[PDB]
Structure 1
Amino acid sequence: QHGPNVCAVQKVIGTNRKYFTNCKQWYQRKICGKSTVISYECCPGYEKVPGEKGCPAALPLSNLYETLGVVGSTTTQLYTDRTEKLRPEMEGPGSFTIFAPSNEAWASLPAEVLDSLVSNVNIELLNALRYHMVGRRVLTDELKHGMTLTSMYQNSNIQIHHYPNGIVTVNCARLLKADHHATNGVVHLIDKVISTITNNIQQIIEIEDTFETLRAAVAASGLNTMLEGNGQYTLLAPTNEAFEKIPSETLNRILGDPEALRDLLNNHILKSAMCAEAIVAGLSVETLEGTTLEVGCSGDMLTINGKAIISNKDILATNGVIHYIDELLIPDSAKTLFELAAESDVSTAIDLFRQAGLGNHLSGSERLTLLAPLNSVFKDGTPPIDAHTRNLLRNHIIKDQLASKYLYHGQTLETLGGKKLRVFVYRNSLCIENSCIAAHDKRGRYGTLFTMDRVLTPPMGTVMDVLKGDNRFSMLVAAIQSAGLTETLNREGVYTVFAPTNEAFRALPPRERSRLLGDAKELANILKYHIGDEILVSGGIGALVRLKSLQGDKLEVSLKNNVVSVNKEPVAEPDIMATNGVVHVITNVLQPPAN
């Protein structure tokens, strides 16, 4: 095993990026989009001994200036000597903390930024290096609290943030090496050369030319004081180009409507300030609007929902962090029934409504609920726009904007016309007739989109009307009349009739065929076993439902790979909707376990 005082260091394959850790047992296989190698080195304040395993020897404590060379901040050390006032301070008495930028941090600085500092060593460079310093010992235990720090330059604040993944940021500069104790302080190696923060989010929006449209939108919504006031927010600030990409018609409606404008702007604000360096993998974040965004990273680029649309990273504000976004994050709450679904996973259903001349129910201000089946439903093809399909699509539009998680047991939904669909709420399922909710509700500005798992088939007549209208149930209808159950299945109720076809009675042995016809009292009990006490649709089974029958004994109703099975027997045609129940076409007659 590894020797004493050995700390594990996670290095990304083919890059300089290292994640210095206190030899943790848990690891993440991939950082952003690339594989990592778990390397090993000495912990802070220890060195290797030749012939001995690990780092047993403890490094002697040297002054804050000398500890710069130890941690590897040679450039920060060199520029300190150039100021000819900071080196005696760092070598002399006291208690200090220096957030020393790495050699790469100085090399990454733009030509104009570096030139201003190196030319005026006594003015610009001295003040810059003093901002990276604190006049007291500040350790990781304090940095993990995420509280602000007072710098050694005009008592200006230093933003310190801690993240659940363990990453600590100093003005959004990732803390590389930490707690490197000195004779007169502590040295911390940081990812970037940090600068003073003077303006808040609102002031930055007011200064930058790229946010002319955003500035106008904030002013129209009255979110000025919110972006001015003290906080810790993250603004995914959209550029003038992001608004330009969106069609005029959509933008002029959202900018005009105060409800949609407030929702649009709240969808670009996050509750807590998050630096780019903090994001190592996918992370679900809730906006002030309420929509869940996935914040990830593709190497060096920040990404929102797998789309690399973050053009500028970490624009530090007094009340937060600003990330320039190339696209507008329009929430569903601002979009019309069309806009939010036209490009979604129900795009095929939307095209069918459009083709049936029902398009204006998706583009308008009408308060409706759209029952749209998934594209996977039409994998075989789409039905032709005819009388049947038109009427069917008409029954997929519900009066009033509804929410599926607020649908109750005996609820009846009115369609655009007069058809009243029944709501069947189950333990883990929610169905409107045969069709069940397959995805989270898409709540629009005026209408909600209900993503369905199948095309809704509204009921046509009673169980008896269904059975008498099909030649396959001639022997079944004849058996039902002999048993005296014609009235029971023709009247209002909640039944699950597992209807055995003509072949089901023909498949019975010559003994059972003549035997079942002979007895009337036993024939009645066999048929009663095929009828259920409550309505159970295919999408409401889930795993296994022990459905009580009119005979008394339970039915083993199960769903496996979209196939309904009653008493381990398959269903040929499931969910045949009736005004008093559901008909499941079976090819075998069911026998009760007892009597």
Structure 2
Amino acid sequence: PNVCAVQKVIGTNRKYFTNCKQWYQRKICGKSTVISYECCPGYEKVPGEKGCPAALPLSNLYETLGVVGSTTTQLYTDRTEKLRPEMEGPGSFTIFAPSNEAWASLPAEVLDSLVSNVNIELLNALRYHMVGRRVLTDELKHGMTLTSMYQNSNIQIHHYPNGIVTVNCARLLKADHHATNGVVHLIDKVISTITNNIQQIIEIEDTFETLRAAVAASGLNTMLEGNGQYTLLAPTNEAFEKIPSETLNRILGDPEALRDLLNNHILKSAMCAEAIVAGLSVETLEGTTLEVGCSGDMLTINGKAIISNKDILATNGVIHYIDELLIPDSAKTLFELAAESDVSTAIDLFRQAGLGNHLSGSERLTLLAPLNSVFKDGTPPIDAHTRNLLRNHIIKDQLASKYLYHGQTLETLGGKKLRVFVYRNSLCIENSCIAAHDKRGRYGTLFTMDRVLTPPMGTVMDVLKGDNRFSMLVAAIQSAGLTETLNREGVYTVFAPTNETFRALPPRERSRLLGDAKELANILKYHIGDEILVSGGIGALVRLKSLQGDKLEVSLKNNVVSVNKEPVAEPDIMATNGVVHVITNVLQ
């Protein structure tokens, strides 16, 4: 009876006292926990019975400090020889009592100045830790400010979905210990008054001289002086200095990039370091998502141990000092956001082909860069053919792929026009289809694609006549009167059989297809779909109506296209009026 739970990390003395819960973090930062059982606030064990059935009497506020083990706090109250009678006397009070470890965590210079002068500075600090009314934890989760008993100075309270409550970002260790004249709460640090806002702290600290100048240039000083609850991830001078000067000055000389940069360091609520016991997704003011986490007593952002100072308190929120600049994708050039990504092979080939200048400045372009896996068996060599193909992977204007439409045409650097095909579960531009979300830079946008592009060469008949494998097919096309259909404008899907497919027709079938041209016309129209279906547009199963009227069964399995259970030998050969797919048997 009345049995409370303690979740202790292993290695430590870091402990989490709760209102008996069942949701447990298996790991806290990176160290697993064990759970144990003690008696709850206000219950004591009896020997020979299980649980803790006996309640203990209440005592006054001074005496209750010993019960929760805050004995250094108790000793210093008695030292003042003024505050101890009040804690034993009439009234209703709350005290946030620092733990013994907290008092021992004070630097020697701050410990020295209060205990030297007991009446003055020790009494004043202690009053800031108190409130002139009883407050239970039910009124502590609201997040409001409380007025302390030191000069009516505000205390800032924060609450998080995991139940952790903080008092000036100090963790609340032991909650809701009732007293005869109030309640005692044990907290994890010694807290101090909060007199500066975020902007004032920036102007004071010499380590933020570069940051201070950036804030001024954006005109953001109005927001950082005002009321609000924010977290700032504040970059030191050394963080700025780790960035190459040509990159960094480019940002600072661009009003838009500067604003996006700074917004990526600001969060919409105040978040204390003690809040974070697992990976959490947060959204910045710029829009990028960051994964906040921790490894031991080191806070980490996206796996990098770059938080060098936690819990700097302001009147309008919390500041954490950060050792690396968090440059968002929207502040980066096209080269910067892709150089270390999944398309890094392709980026190197643009550089070797002389096209790196297109990616490195401010031109409004869209880059179609295939994935590294396309180039698994080797890179193509840098000829004039490869050079020409690469110019046609750079699209005029900065575009967003979710706003693309079917009848849109995309113009390349040189003079060609590429067609967009939007399907239900994939989006394609000529033969190449988007394989992951866009990365939007400041001036250009990277589309990640699954394949190298193949721009079209002439009509369907231009494709088939240029290859000796379709000599029997071309004569058959001509005999049926279909040649001029496929040399004019259109949106065809041609499953084009080779000579070796014709070489499989039985003798009885081979000469019955030759004579009966009205029958030949009807057979051929069954092989022609009425819209352009590239291989990256099929997904699982699509029916495509033929010109004869009946439907073909098209499917995609293990990256291989099948049509009516016949595999395609060579897909996605582009033509100005359609697409040609090679097949190795004739359909019926």
Distance 1:48 1:517 in 2: 101
- Structure 1 residue 523: Cα displacement: 5.1
Change (3 A) 1:506 1:135: farther
Change (3 A) 1:549 1:143: farther
Distance 2:564 2:39 in 1: 66
Deviates more, 1:485-494 or 1:252-261: 485-494
Scaled by the length of structure 2, the TM-score of the pair is 0.94
Number of positions where the alignment pairs a residue of Structure 1 with one of Structure 2: 588
Distance 1:190 1:176 in 2: 5
Change (3 A) 1:388 1:182: same
Question: For 1:489, which of 477, 481, 486 is the aligned residue?
Answer: 486
Deviations 1:539-562 (A, max 9, x none): 222333333333333333333333
Question: For 1:279, which of 268, 276, 282 is the aligned residue?
Answer: 276
Deviations 1:35-58 (A, max 9, x none): 222333333323333343333333
Instruction: Report whether the alignment pairs 1:82 with 2:74.
Output: no
- Structure 1 residue 524: Cα displacement: 4.6
Change (3 A) 1:96 1:514: farther
Scaled by the length of structure 1, the TM-score of the pair is 0.93
- Structure 1 residue 508: Cα displacement: 5.8
Distance 2:24 2:110 in 1: 38
Change (3 A) 1:457 1:203: same
SS at match of 2:462: helix
- Structure 1 residue 194: Cα displacement: 1.1
SS at match of 1:296: strand
- Structure 1 residue 505: Cα displacement: 4.2
Change (3 A) 1:560 1:138: farther
Query: 1:9-28 residue pairs with structure 2 within 5 A?
Result: 9-28=6-25
SS at match of 1:565: strand
Deviates more, 1:153-162 or 1:139-148: 139-148
Deviations 1:193-249 (A, max 9, x none): 111111111111111111111111112222112211111111111111111111111
Deviates more, 1:47-56 or 1:151-160: 47-56
Change (3 A) 1:350 1:96: same
Distance 1:278 1:566 in 2: 56
Distance 1:155 1:344 in 2: 54
Deviations 1:472-524 (A, max 9, x none): 33343344344444333333222333333334444566776666667656655
- 1:155 corresponds to which residue? 152
What's the % identity of the aligned pairs? 100
- Structure 1 residue 182: Cα displacement: 1.9
Deviates more, 1:491-500 or 1:375-384: 491-500
Distance 1:102 1:233 in 2: 28
Deviates more, 1:578-587 or 1:97-106: 578-587
Deviates more, 1:89-98 or 1:505-514: 505-514
Deviations 1:391-436 (A, max 9, x none): 1110011111111122122111111111111111122322211222
- Structure 1 residue 373: Cα displacement: 1.6
SS at match of 1:573: strand
Change (3 A) 1:462 1:167: farther
SS at match of 1:57: coil
Change (3 A) 1:129 1:538: farther
- Structure 1 residue 127: Cα displacement: 1.8
Deviates more, 1:168-177 or 1:503-512: 503-512
Deviations 1:422-470 (A, max 9, x none): 1111223222112222233222222222222222221222223222222
Change (3 A) 1:11 1:523: farther
Structure 1 unaligned spans of 5+: none
Deviates more, 1:460-469 or 1:421-430: 460-469
- Structure 1 residue 59: Cα displacement: 3.8
Change (3 A) 1:185 1:419: same
Distance 1:120 1:514 in 2: 115
Deviations 1:355-374 (A, max 9, x none): 11111111122111111122
SS at match of 1:451: strand
Change (3 A) 1:102 1:426: farther
SS at match of 2:335: coil
- Structure 1 residue 171: Cα displacement: 0.8
SS at match of 2:260: helix
SS at match of 2:461: helix
Question: For 2:204, which of 193, 207, 217 is the aligned residue?
Answer: 207
- Structure 1 residue 71: Cα displacement: 2.6
Deviates more, 1:563-572 or 1:26-35: 563-572
Distance 2:561 2:53 in 1: 67
Change (3 A) 1:200 1:387: same
SS at match of 1:383: coil
- Structure 1 residue 76: Cα displacement: 2.0
Distance 1:62 1:514 in 2: 110
Deviations 1:114-169 (A, max 9, x none): 22223223222222222121111222222211111111111111111111222221
Deviates more, 1:436-445 or 1:227-236: 436-445
Deviates more, 1:474-483 or 1:10-19: 474-483
SS at match of 2:571: strand
SS at match of 1:262: helix
Change (3 A) 1:117 1:417: same
Deviates more, 1:140-149 or 1:371-380: 371-380
Distance 1:39 1:576 in 2: 68
Deviates more, 1:252-261 or 1:518-527: 518-527
Change (3 A) 1:7 1:532: farther
- 1:516 corresponds to which residue? 513
Change (3 A) 1:210 1:582: same
Deviates more, 1:197-206 or 1:43-52: 43-52
Distance 1:511 1:123 in 2: 114
Change (3 A) 1:411 1:94: same
Change (3 A) 1:134 1:373: same
Change (3 A) 1:245 1:65: same
Deviates more, 1:235-244 or 1:452-461: 452-461
Distance 1:589 1:192 in 2: 80
Deviates more, 1:196-205 or 1:139-148: 139-148
Deviates more, 1:313-322 or 1:549-558: 549-558
Distance 1:181 1:338 in 2: 62
Distance 2:482 2:36 in 1: 77
- 1:135 corresponds to which residue? 132
- Structure 1 residue 15: Cα displacement: 2.3
SS at match of 2:524: helix
- Structure 1 residue 351: Cα displacement: 1.3
- Structure 1 residue 568: Cα displacement: 4.2
Question: For 2:501, which of 501, 504, 507 is the aligned residue?
Answer: 504
Note the aligned Cα RMSD (angstroms): 2.3
Change (3 A) 1:188 1:573: farther
Change (3 A) 1:70 1:444: same
Distance 1:102 1:218 in 2: 38
Change (3 A) 1:458 1:60: farther
Instruction: Report whether the alignment pairs 1:573 with 2:570.
Output: yes
Distance 1:7 1:559 in 2: 58
Instruction: Report whether the alignment pairs 1:253 with 2:262.
Output: no
Instruction: Report whether the alignment pairs 1:43 with 2:40.
Output: yes
Deviates more, 1:424-433 or 1:565-574: 565-574
- 1:178 corresponds to which residue? 175
- Structure 1 residue 530: Cα displacement: 3.5
